[PDB]
Amino acid sequence: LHWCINPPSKIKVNFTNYCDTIGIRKSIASAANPILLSALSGGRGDIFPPYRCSGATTSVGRVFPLSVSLSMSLISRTSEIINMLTAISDGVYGKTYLLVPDYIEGGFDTQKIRVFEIGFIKRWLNDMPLLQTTNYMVLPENSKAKVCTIAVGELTLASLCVDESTVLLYHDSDGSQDGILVVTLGIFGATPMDQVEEVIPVAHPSVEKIHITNHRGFIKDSIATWMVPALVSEKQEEQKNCLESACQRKSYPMCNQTSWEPFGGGQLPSYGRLTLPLDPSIDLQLNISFTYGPVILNGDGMDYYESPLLDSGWLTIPPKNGTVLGLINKASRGDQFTVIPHVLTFAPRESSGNCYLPIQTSQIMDKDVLTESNLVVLPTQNFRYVIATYDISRGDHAIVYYVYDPIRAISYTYPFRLTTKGRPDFLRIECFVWDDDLWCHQFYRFEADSTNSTTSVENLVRIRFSC
Amino acid sequence: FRDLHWCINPPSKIKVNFTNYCDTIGIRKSIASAANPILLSALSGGRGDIFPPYRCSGATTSVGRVFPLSVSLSMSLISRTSEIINMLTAISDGVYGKTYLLVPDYIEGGFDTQKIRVFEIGFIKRWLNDMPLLQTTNYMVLPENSKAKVCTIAVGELTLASLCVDESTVLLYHDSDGSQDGILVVTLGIFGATPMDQVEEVIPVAHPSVEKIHITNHRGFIKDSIATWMVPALVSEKQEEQKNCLESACQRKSYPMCNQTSWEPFGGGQLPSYGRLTLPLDPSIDLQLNISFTYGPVILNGDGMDYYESPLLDSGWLTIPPKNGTVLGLINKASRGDQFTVIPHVLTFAPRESSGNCYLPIQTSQIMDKDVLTESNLVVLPTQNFRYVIATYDISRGDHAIVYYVYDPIRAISYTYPFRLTTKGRPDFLRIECFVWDDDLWCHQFYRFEADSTNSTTSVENLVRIRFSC
Amino acid sequence: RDLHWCINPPSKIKVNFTNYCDTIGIRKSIASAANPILLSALSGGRGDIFPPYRCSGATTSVGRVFPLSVSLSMSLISRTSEIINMLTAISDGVYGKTYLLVPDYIEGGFDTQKIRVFEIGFIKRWLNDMPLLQTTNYMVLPENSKAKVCTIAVGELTLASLCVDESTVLLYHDSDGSQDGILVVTLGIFGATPMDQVEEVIPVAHPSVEKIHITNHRGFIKDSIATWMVPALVSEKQEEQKNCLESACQRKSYPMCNQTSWEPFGGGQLPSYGRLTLPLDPSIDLQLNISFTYGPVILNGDGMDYYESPLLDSGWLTIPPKNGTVLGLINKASRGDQFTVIPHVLTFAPRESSGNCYLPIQTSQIMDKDVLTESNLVVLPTQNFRYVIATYDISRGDHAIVYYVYDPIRAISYTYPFRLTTKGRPDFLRIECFVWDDDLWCHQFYRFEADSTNSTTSVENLVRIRFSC
Amino acid sequence: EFDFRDLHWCINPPSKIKVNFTNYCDTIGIRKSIASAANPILLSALSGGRGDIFPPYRCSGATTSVGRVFPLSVSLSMSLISRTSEIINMLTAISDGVYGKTYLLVPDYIEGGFDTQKIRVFEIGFIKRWLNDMPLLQTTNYMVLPENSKAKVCTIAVGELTLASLCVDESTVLLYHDSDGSQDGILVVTLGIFGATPMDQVEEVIPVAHPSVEKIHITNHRGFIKDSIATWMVPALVSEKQEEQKNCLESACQRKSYPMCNQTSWEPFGGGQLPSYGRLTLPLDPSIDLQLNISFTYGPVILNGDGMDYYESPLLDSGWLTIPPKNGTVLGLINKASRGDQFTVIPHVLTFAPRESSGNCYLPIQTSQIMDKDVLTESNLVVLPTQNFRYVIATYDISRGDHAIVYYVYDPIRAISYTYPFRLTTKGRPDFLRIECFVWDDDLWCHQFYRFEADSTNSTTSVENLVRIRFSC
C-alpha cells in the first residue's frame, strides 16, 4: 500500500506542457507588471475632491481622440463595428465587437465577424491614457459568436459566446444541449489564448434557462464571474406574493402584464452567476449558480463590477424605457450566491421587507427617446455610479453624464461638434479613474435619413470636477 | 501495464504543490517562445514564393493598391493631424520599428515648444483576406535630450536598436578635447519591461585613424545578437590612391566630380570612407560600439547609407540613395565580423586604365530633369533573387503621382501610383521600406509635402502593394 | 478505502517528505528528550520511602560512601583545586551546584581571585542502582563585580540564582542614587535560549522592607516560578514582638533577653521572613517580588532553606542550628498571593503570652565543649516529614560525621568512622539528602583546616544510610 | 485504457516514514532542535581552533617542542580510572568538537564470587573551553550495554552530534561461511549527543555488495560521520586479489624484503590470500533503516591486521586511510581512499613502487635493524584535520633514560620529537597503546591511552591523560 497523491486533471496528461504554460504565464506577468504599476499608481489614489473651496463645483469635459486600439483604427476606415462591449479593470482593457468586412463589396449583408482584443492603458506625455492593443483574436465565421460577454482581468480576457440570446440549460437536455463557446485571450500571443465549446453544468435541476444578451464581469483570483438572468421554479411563490402585495398600490401596469420581458410569459427571472475557473491546472467548466432577490423588470443587461470588500461585487442593471431607475444590488462572489439590494430598490409598503422592487412610472418619464446607457460603478473607496444618456431637450444632440452624489446635482452641456442629427439605437459607456478623474469610454451607433450606412462613433471623454 | 500496486490515500498532513517541482523559464526565452507562432505566420508567407513560376502570357504587368488599415501608433498620430518628422522604418522577419520626431500641437506654448523622439516596435500580423496589419506591441518616448535629434533604426530578433546623436558629425578624438560627442544607445524589447538600455556610450574608436562619424539616416539589422550599421567616416591615412584615381578620371567627361575642392559629407579634406558601427546586444556583456572602417568605391552622396541583410553567411548590401538625380545610387557588398571589406556589386563604374582599386559611381547629367524629383532610398528585397526598389516623386503626371521603379538584373519594371489626391505641395522627405509577403511586394512609405500655406506640412504614411502577374 | 491503481510519476516529481509537518520548539524538544531520565529517577526512587511494616521495630543503620561521579566539581576537587562555598540543590531528578572556584596555580597574598561556576545535570543509575551525578551543562562567571554569595534553586530542567556582592542587600537606603541590584543567573539542562544572565532593577512590593540578607539559601522552581526565602528587616513587626520580648525578659529565660543586637543586622529590630519570588518566563517581566510576613523570631539569619511540601501550594522552611543555640527551626510557608508562616515543629510556644510570638528551644548547658559544625536541616521529599541534619563531632575518636535523622516519634543516628584528618577542623559542612530506591542518599561537602595554615581540602562525596527493620 | 480522473500518481516514502510519519518527523524535529541548541558550542570550538594552524616562518632556527599534561576532565572514563578500576581497549575519536569513547569496563568496586563479566560502555560528549583556552572533555551522554555484552570488540565513529560503532563478538566476521547455521550479525550501537530518543541498538545482517567478499577483520577501526553517513575501513578477504598480488610479490621479492615472501601465511587471515581493503558505510538517517554495505577495492599489501583508521580529508570525497606499523616494520601506511562512490584506494603516502618492474603495484618499506631487541611500542598514526597534510605517531620505549613516551610529530621537511618523563613506573609493560590528536588554540592536543602492566606487583594499570605539544620558534 503506497501513497497516492491526487493531481488535478490536465496536469497528468502533460506535466511538462502544463509547467511550460505556468512558466510562460509567470514570465509574461512579470514583464507586464511595471506597465501595470505605472498605469495604476496615478489611478488608484482617489476620486473625491480633497478640499472644499468654492462649494458648488464646475464640470469641464474634454474629448481625447487618440488611441492605438484596433477598434478605432477600423472605425476610422468607415468599417461597420456594431455591438461593442468593453471592460476596463486591473489596468488592462478588453473589447468584443462584430465586424462587417467592407474591404470587398459583395451583396449587402453576407457575414459578420467577431473580434476580441485585450490591451494596456498607458500615459502619453500629458498624463493621459493611451489605449494600446497588445493582442487580438478573430473567430471563424462558422461559429456561435453572435452574443458574447466581456470580462477582463489579471492580464487575461474571457468570454461566453452563444449564437442564441437565451441558452436552454435544462429544457434541451433530451436533445443536444446548448453549449457556450468560452473564448479566452492572453495579453501576448501564447497558449492562454484558447477557445472551446463546453457543456455548462447546471446549478440544480431547478434552473431551466439562461439569458445572455449584453453582460460584463471581471476576473480576480483566477476566476471569471458574470451575472445573467435565469429561470427557476422555486422563487415563483414568494415573488408572486410580493408582486401581489405591491399590486394594490398605484403600480397597476406592473401586475397587469401577463408576459415578462426576459422570458415570454411564465414566471419571474432569477439572478444567475456564471463562474468560470480560469486556471491552467484544470479544464474549463462554467459553474452556474442562482439566488432569489429583488424583482427584475428588464433583461437587456446585467453587469457585475468589483467592490472594495472581500468577496462581494456590485450588480448593476441598465434602466429601460418605463423603469426610471436601475438596480445596483450587491452580489456575493464566494461559495454561496447572495443578492442584497444595496441601493436603488424601492421597498414596498405593508411588506415583510424580504422582497424589494424597482421604481417605475407611467407618465413621469419624458416622451423623448432619451436613450440611456449602462450605469457604471467607479473603482474607488467612495461609492459613485455613472450613467450616460442621449439628451434631446437642447437644440443640439448631446450626451449627459450623471455622477451621482447626495450633496449636489449639476449637469451642464458643452456643444458636441460631431453630429447634430442623432438616432441612437445603442449606447455603452465604460468608466475608470485616471489621475483623480473620470475617464469614460463611450460607444454609440446612429441611423441616418439617407440610410446608406449607419455610423458607429466611439471616443474617450474626461469630466473634471474642479472646486 | 505494470502498475506499482494498489494505494491508500496518505494522511491529509501532506499537501503537495505541483508548481514547485519544475523550473522557471526566463523572461526573454518565454517572450521569444510566445512570439514565435506570430513570426512563423509571416515567415511562411514570405518564403512561400518569390517570383512567378512561368511566363503564362509571355509578359507581366503590375497591379497596385493602397492598404490604409494599420493599428500602429504612427498612423494613429497622423490621423490626429499631429506633425511627424523624419520617420525611419526597418521591416524585417515580421518585426518592424520606427523612429520619428513628434511636434505636439495640443501643447500650446510660444510658437515652437519641442520635438520628442519616439520609438516603437511590433509585429506584422495576418489580417483577414491575408493582408499585412502592422501592430505595435511596445513603444518608448525619450525625455527631452539633445542627443535624440538624429537616430538610426535596426530591427531584428524581437528587439530594437538605435544610435542617437546630437550633432550630425560625431567627432572621434583621443581622450576629451574640449566638448566631446557621445553616441546615445537605445534598445526596446518586443513586449513589456524586459532588459533594455537607454545608456549614453563613448565610442571605442578601434583603429585611431577614424576622426569623424556622419549619421544622417541609416538602417541596419540585428543578426546573431549583433546590430550593424554603415556610416561614412573621415580617416587621414590612405588618400593618395583615391586622389590619383580622381585625377585620372578628371580628364574624362566626369568633370563636375573632379572639380569639387570640398566634398559633401565632410567639408574639405579627404573624401569619406566606409565605416561600420557594431553593437553586440549580449546582455551579459557590457555594450561596446566597435568601428571597422575600410575604403571602397568613391562616395558622392554621403547623406544616408542603409544596410540590408544578404543570403550569404557574413554579407550585406549597403546602399546609397540617389542625390539630386544627377548621381545614381550604389549597392555595395559589405562583410560582417572581425574583418570588413567592400566589394562593388551594382550601379558601379570601373575606370579604364586605372589603378584598379577605385570604383566610381555612375554620374550622368542627362538624367537630371527640371521636374521636381525626390528619390527615396534603395531597398534590397529579402529574397534570394537580387532585386532593389526605387520610389520617385514626380509631377510630370497630371495626378501628382508617385512612381515605383522595381529593378532586376535582367529587366526593369516601373509602376506609377496615380492614387495621389493632393496635387498642391512639394515633397520634402520621402522614404520607403519594402518587404515580401505572400509572393507579393509591399512597400511601407512615408513622405511630407509643404502646401501653399507655407507653414503646413502634412505627413502622409500608408502601405502600398504592387502585384506582378504572369 | 483502497484507491485503485498507480502510474509512475514523471521523473521531475520528487518529494522530500520533510517540509510537511510541525517544527518542535527548543524547550519542548529538550523536555521530551530529557523526560525518560527524570522518569527513571523519580519512579525508581520515590516509590518506596519508609519500611512498610513494623517487623522487629528496632532498626540498625548501615552506611556506605559512593565516590564515583561525573560531576565537574568532583573532578575539580580530585585535581586539588579549592572550592570554598558550594550549594547543591537536588530535586525531581536533576541537580545543580554553585561554588567559588579558586585557581591556586599562581598565588599571591591571600586570594588572587575566586570565580563562580554554576552547573546543572541529571541523576543517573550506574548499573548497581546507585546515583551517578552526571553534569550536562555549566556556566562560569568571571569575578568582575558580583561573585560573593548566591542562592541555588533547581527544578523543571532549569537553574536559578540571585548573586550579590554585598552580604546584605541595601534595598532602600541607596534609593537616593542607584539602589543595589541582584545578578539573576539562569541555566538550562542543555545550551539553549533559557540560559540567560540579566541583572534586574527591583520594583519593591513593600515600602517597609529595606534589607535583604543573601548569604546561603536554597529554593525550588515550581510551575515555572523560582521562589526562595530570605530574612528581611522591617520595623512594624517589632511593635508586636516587643510585648513577647518583655514578657520573656522577666521570665526565668534570661539568655533570651540577654541579647541586645542580632548578627544579621546590627542593632535594629527582629528580622522577618521575606518570600523572594522570580517568575521564570523567557519573554516578559523577569523581576523579583519581596513579600515579608510575621512569624517565629529568628535567632540566626545565617541561612534559610526552602523545601517543597506535599500540600497544594505550601512549602517548608528551615534554619540551620548555630553555635550557642541547641536547635534549628522548621515552620510552614505558603506560596502564591498572600504569604503566611505558621510554625510546624521545633518551636516552643511561651506560656502567658499573647500568641503572636514563638521561641525555639535553647539550653545553655547541654552543649558539649568540642566545636561541632552542623549542616542545614534537610526535608526529605516524601509524604511523611523526616528532617535530617548532619553534625561533625570531635568527641568521638574517629572524627566521624554523625547523621541525626530526626523524627518526632523515633530518633535514629549513624556515625561515619572515615577520614580521620585529626589536624583538620571543618569550616563549612553542607548536605543535600534525597530518597533513592528506598534509601537515604545524602550529598555531603566540607573543608578542613590546617595546623600549617597551608592545607585546605574540600571533600565532596555522596553517602547513603540504610535502615532495615 | 485507464480513466485518468480515477487514476493517481503515487510516491514512494522511506520505510520509517510510511509506518509512522508523525513519529518520524517528531524525531526529526527533536534532533534538529537539539542540533540547533548544541550549535553554539561547536561554533565556539571551531572559532577557537581554526586560527593559526602553523607558526610563522622560522625566525632564528628550528622550532622547539613544549609538552604539558592536562589531567582535568569531566569524562566518565577518567572518573572510572581514578577509582582504581581497569579500562580495557578504549578507542577515542575526536572530530568537529565532539568526541566519543568505547571502553571495556571491569567491575571491581562490587565483587560477587570471582568475576561476573566485562561491560562495554559507549560515551559521547563535547569539547569545551575552560576559561584557560584548553579543552574540557565533558560527557553529555553515555550508554552501558547490558550484562550479556554481545559487544566484545567495537569500532568508533563520531560526527554530526552522533556516535556510531559496529560491534562484533569475534575478530573475524564470516559473511558467507556461517550462513549454514546462524549468520554472523553485527551489533550497531548509536547514541545522540543528548536526550533519550536517538539511541538504537540492533543486530543486523550485512548486505555486502558482492559474494566475492567472504571475511572482514574488525579489531580497531576509527572512522568518522559526514553527510549522515558513518564510514569505517577493515581488512577484507577476496579471491581475485591473488592474480595481481602474487605477481607483484614475486616481481618485488628479489629486493631485501625477503621475509615478506618467506611468510607462508598472512597475519590478518591464516593462509588464504592477501588482505584487501574494505569499506563499511552506515547511513545514519531517521528516514532509512540501518544497513551496512561493505565495499572493497585493491591496494598495497596489508602487513598487519591490527586495524585500519579512516580519517577526514579536506577534499570533497577523500579520506586519509591509515594503518599502524607492526613489530619489525618501522613504517606504517597512510593511503588515500574515496567515500560515497565506487571504492577506490590510491596509495598516496608510505608506498614506494619497486623499480625495474611493471609499476602498477606499490609496496611499503621494511627494515628489521631499527627495532633491535628492546620493548618499543608504537601507536596508530593520526592524520590531523589541517590544511597542510600531517601525521603523528607516539612511541613508548625503555631506551629513553626517563622511561618516557616519545611523540614523533612528522613534518614534510623533518621530524620533531618530545619526551614525557612523567613516567615514574620503570616496571611497565605496555599491553595496549593508542593516541588521538586534534588542533585547538594554535597547538597540538593529543589524547593518549597506554594500558601498561606493572611488574612490581603484577597488576595491570590503565593510564590515560591529555597532552599538548607546542612548537615555538
PDB file of C-alpha atoms in Angstrom, chain C residues 181-311:
ATOM      1  CA  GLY C 181      20.750  45.007  42.331  1.00  0.00           C
ATOM      2  CA  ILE C 182      20.853  41.184  42.287  1.00  0.00           C
ATOM      3  CA  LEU C 183      22.620  39.424  39.359  1.00  0.00           C
ATOM      4  CA  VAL C 184      19.927  36.923  38.315  1.00  0.00           C
ATOM      5  CA  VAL C 185      21.532  33.840  36.744  1.00  0.00           C
ATOM      6  CA  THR C 186      19.570  31.112  34.963  1.00  0.00           C
ATOM      7  CA  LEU C 187      20.796  27.873  33.391  1.00  0.00           C
ATOM      8  CA  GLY C 188      19.211  25.134  31.320  1.00  0.00           C
ATOM      9  CA  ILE C 189      19.925  21.434  31.051  1.00  0.00           C
ATOM     10  CA  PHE C 190      21.262  21.848  27.508  1.00  0.00           C
ATOM     11  CA  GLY C 191      22.718  25.007  25.995  1.00  0.00           C
ATOM     12  CA  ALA C 192      19.742  26.942  24.654  1.00  0.00           C
ATOM     13  CA  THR C 193      17.552  30.043  24.958  1.00  0.00           C
ATOM     14  CA  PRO C 194      16.646  29.754  28.697  1.00  0.00           C
ATOM     15  CA  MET C 195      20.324  30.264  29.569  1.00  0.00           C
ATOM     16  CA  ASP C 196      20.478  33.988  30.331  1.00  0.00           C
ATOM     17  CA  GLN C 197      22.038  36.424  32.806  1.00  0.00           C
ATOM     18  CA  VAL C 198      20.047  39.666  33.020  1.00  0.00           C
ATOM     19  CA  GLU C 199      20.672  41.856  36.104  1.00  0.00           C
ATOM     20  CA  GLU C 200      17.232  43.293  37.005  1.00  0.00           C
ATOM     21  CA  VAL C 201      16.250  46.657  38.629  1.00  0.00           C
ATOM     22  CA  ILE C 202      13.857  45.874  41.541  1.00  0.00           C
ATOM     23  CA  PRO C 203      10.285  47.241  41.969  1.00  0.00           C
ATOM     24  CA  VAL C 204       9.585  46.727  45.719  1.00  0.00           C
ATOM     25  CA  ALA C 205       6.160  45.409  46.863  1.00  0.00           C
ATOM     26  CA  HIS C 206       6.570  46.845  50.401  1.00  0.00           C
ATOM     27  CA  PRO C 207       7.974  50.324  51.370  1.00  0.00           C
ATOM     28  CA  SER C 208       8.737  48.899  54.868  1.00  0.00           C
ATOM     29  CA  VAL C 209      11.259  46.251  53.633  1.00  0.00           C
ATOM     30  CA  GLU C 210      14.794  47.805  53.455  1.00  0.00           C
ATOM     31  CA  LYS C 211      17.351  44.988  53.844  1.00  0.00           C
ATOM     32  CA  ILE C 212      17.689  41.584  52.196  1.00  0.00           C
ATOM     33  CA  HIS C 213      20.264  39.206  53.691  1.00  0.00           C
ATOM     34  CA  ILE C 214      21.506  36.867  50.947  1.00  0.00           C
ATOM     35  CA  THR C 215      24.132  34.555  52.460  1.00  0.00           C
ATOM     36  CA  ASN C 216      23.285  30.913  51.572  1.00  0.00           C
ATOM     37  CA  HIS C 217      19.742  29.858  50.611  1.00  0.00           C
ATOM     38  CA  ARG C 218      18.063  27.026  48.729  1.00  0.00           C
ATOM     39  CA  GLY C 219      14.782  27.229  46.855  1.00  0.00           C
ATOM     40  CA  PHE C 220      12.852  25.339  44.191  1.00  0.00           C
ATOM     41  CA  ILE C 221      11.429  26.098  40.756  1.00  0.00           C
ATOM     42  CA  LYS C 222       7.744  25.143  40.897  1.00  0.00           C
ATOM     43  CA  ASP C 223       5.364  25.798  37.989  1.00  0.00           C
ATOM     44  CA  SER C 224       7.973  27.917  36.178  1.00  0.00           C
ATOM     45  CA  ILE C 225       8.305  30.213  39.217  1.00  0.00           C
ATOM     46  CA  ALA C 226      11.567  30.222  41.189  1.00  0.00           C
ATOM     47  CA  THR C 227      11.000  31.157  44.834  1.00  0.00           C
ATOM     48  CA  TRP C 228      13.469  31.432  47.705  1.00  0.00           C
ATOM     49  CA  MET C 229      13.194  32.502  51.353  1.00  0.00           C
ATOM     50  CA  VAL C 230      15.393  35.302  52.701  1.00  0.00           C
ATOM     51  CA  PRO C 231      15.066  37.083  56.070  1.00  0.00           C
ATOM     52  CA  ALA C 232      14.106  40.747  55.757  1.00  0.00           C
ATOM     53  CA  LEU C 233      14.187  43.736  58.105  1.00  0.00           C
ATOM     54  CA  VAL C 234      11.001  45.640  58.979  1.00  0.00           C
ATOM     55  CA  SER C 235      10.139  47.984  61.844  1.00  0.00           C
ATOM     56  CA  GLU C 236       6.394  47.334  62.180  1.00  0.00           C
ATOM     57  CA  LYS C 237       6.655  43.714  63.358  1.00  0.00           C
ATOM     58  CA  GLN C 238       8.857  44.680  66.313  1.00  0.00           C
ATOM     59  CA  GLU C 239       5.899  46.543  67.831  1.00  0.00           C
ATOM     60  CA  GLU C 240       4.024  43.243  68.137  1.00  0.00           C
ATOM     61  CA  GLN C 241       7.145  41.287  69.122  1.00  0.00           C
ATOM     62  CA  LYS C 242       8.021  43.764  71.895  1.00  0.00           C
ATOM     63  CA  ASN C 243       5.284  42.532  74.237  1.00  0.00           C
ATOM     64  CA  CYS C 244       6.514  38.940  73.941  1.00  0.00           C
ATOM     65  CA  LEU C 245      10.120  40.080  74.386  1.00  0.00           C
ATOM     66  CA  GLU C 246       9.207  41.977  77.565  1.00  0.00           C
ATOM     67  CA  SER C 247       7.221  39.004  78.879  1.00  0.00           C
ATOM     68  CA  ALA C 248      10.179  36.681  78.275  1.00  0.00           C
ATOM     69  CA  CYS C 249      12.651  39.168  79.791  1.00  0.00           C
ATOM     70  CA  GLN C 250      11.056  38.950  83.246  1.00  0.00           C
ATOM     71  CA  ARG C 251      10.779  35.164  82.855  1.00  0.00           C
ATOM     72  CA  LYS C 252      13.468  32.748  84.030  1.00  0.00           C
ATOM     73  CA  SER C 253      14.800  32.513  80.441  1.00  0.00           C
ATOM     74  CA  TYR C 254      17.440  35.196  80.908  1.00  0.00           C
ATOM     75  CA  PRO C 255      19.628  34.348  77.846  1.00  0.00           C
ATOM     76  CA  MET C 256      16.725  35.175  75.514  1.00  0.00           C
ATOM     77  CA  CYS C 257      16.567  38.793  76.707  1.00  0.00           C
ATOM     78  CA  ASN C 258      20.342  38.917  77.243  1.00  0.00           C
ATOM     79  CA  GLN C 259      20.805  39.516  73.510  1.00  0.00           C
ATOM     80  CA  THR C 260      20.789  43.196  72.541  1.00  0.00           C
ATOM     81  CA  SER C 261      21.981  43.157  68.906  1.00  0.00           C
ATOM     82  CA  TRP C 262      21.493  40.440  66.298  1.00  0.00           C
ATOM     83  CA  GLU C 263      24.050  39.123  63.823  1.00  0.00           C
ATOM     84  CA  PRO C 264      22.118  39.737  60.546  1.00  0.00           C
ATOM     85  CA  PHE C 265      21.589  43.461  61.224  1.00  0.00           C
ATOM     86  CA  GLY C 266      23.453  45.369  63.972  1.00  0.00           C
ATOM     87  CA  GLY C 267      21.043  46.924  66.490  1.00  0.00           C
ATOM     88  CA  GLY C 268      17.737  47.253  64.600  1.00  0.00           C
ATOM     89  CA  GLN C 269      14.711  45.012  65.162  1.00  0.00           C
ATOM     90  CA  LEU C 270      13.738  41.361  64.822  1.00  0.00           C
ATOM     91  CA  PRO C 271      14.062  40.243  61.174  1.00  0.00           C
ATOM     92  CA  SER C 272      11.087  38.690  59.407  1.00  0.00           C
ATOM     93  CA  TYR C 273      10.779  36.101  56.657  1.00  0.00           C
ATOM     94  CA  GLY C 274      10.670  37.512  53.141  1.00  0.00           C
ATOM     95  CA  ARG C 275       9.409  35.352  50.268  1.00  0.00           C
ATOM     96  CA  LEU C 276      11.594  36.198  47.298  1.00  0.00           C
ATOM     97  CA  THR C 277       9.897  35.183  44.055  1.00  0.00           C
ATOM     98  CA  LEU C 278      11.246  35.170  40.490  1.00  0.00           C
ATOM     99  CA  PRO C 279       8.652  34.181  37.867  1.00  0.00           C
ATOM    100  CA  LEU C 280      10.764  32.446  35.214  1.00  0.00           C
ATOM    101  CA  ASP C 281       9.226  33.425  31.888  1.00  0.00           C
ATOM    102  CA  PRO C 282      11.521  33.606  28.832  1.00  0.00           C
ATOM    103  CA  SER C 283       9.593  36.540  27.322  1.00  0.00           C
ATOM    104  CA  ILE C 284       8.246  39.122  29.771  1.00  0.00           C
ATOM    105  CA  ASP C 285       8.969  40.581  33.209  1.00  0.00           C
ATOM    106  CA  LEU C 286      11.949  38.813  34.738  1.00  0.00           C
ATOM    107  CA  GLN C 287      11.560  40.704  38.011  1.00  0.00           C
ATOM    108  CA  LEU C 288      11.649  39.821  41.700  1.00  0.00           C
ATOM    109  CA  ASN C 289       8.951  40.101  44.363  1.00  0.00           C
ATOM    110  CA  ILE C 290       9.567  40.508  48.104  1.00  0.00           C
ATOM    111  CA  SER C 291       6.633  39.786  50.444  1.00  0.00           C
ATOM    112  CA  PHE C 292       7.533  39.994  54.130  1.00  0.00           C
ATOM    113  CA  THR C 293       5.497  38.203  56.795  1.00  0.00           C
ATOM    114  CA  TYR C 294       5.436  37.757  60.581  1.00  0.00           C
ATOM    115  CA  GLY C 295       6.486  34.516  62.225  1.00  0.00           C
ATOM    116  CA  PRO C 296       8.693  32.910  64.862  1.00  0.00           C
ATOM    117  CA  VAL C 297      11.644  35.008  65.967  1.00  0.00           C
ATOM    118  CA  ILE C 298      14.898  34.492  64.067  1.00  0.00           C
ATOM    119  CA  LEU C 299      17.780  33.607  66.377  1.00  0.00           C
ATOM    120  CA  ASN C 300      20.198  33.215  63.444  1.00  0.00           C
ATOM    121  CA  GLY C 301      19.791  34.618  59.942  1.00  0.00           C
ATOM    122  CA  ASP C 302      22.896  32.906  58.590  1.00  0.00           C
ATOM    123  CA  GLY C 303      20.940  30.532  56.355  1.00  0.00           C
ATOM    124  CA  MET C 304      17.345  29.696  55.388  1.00  0.00           C
ATOM    125  CA  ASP C 305      16.308  26.868  53.022  1.00  0.00           C
ATOM    126  CA  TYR C 306      13.013  26.380  51.180  1.00  0.00           C
ATOM    127  CA  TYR C 307      11.900  22.793  50.543  1.00  0.00           C
ATOM    128  CA  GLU C 308       8.768  21.775  48.674  1.00  0.00           C
ATOM    129  CA  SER C 309       5.868  20.421  50.726  1.00  0.00           C
ATOM    130  CA  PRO C 310       3.422  17.654  49.715  1.00  0.00           C
ATOM    131  CA  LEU C 311       0.483  20.052  50.210  1.00  0.00           C
TER     132      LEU C 311
END
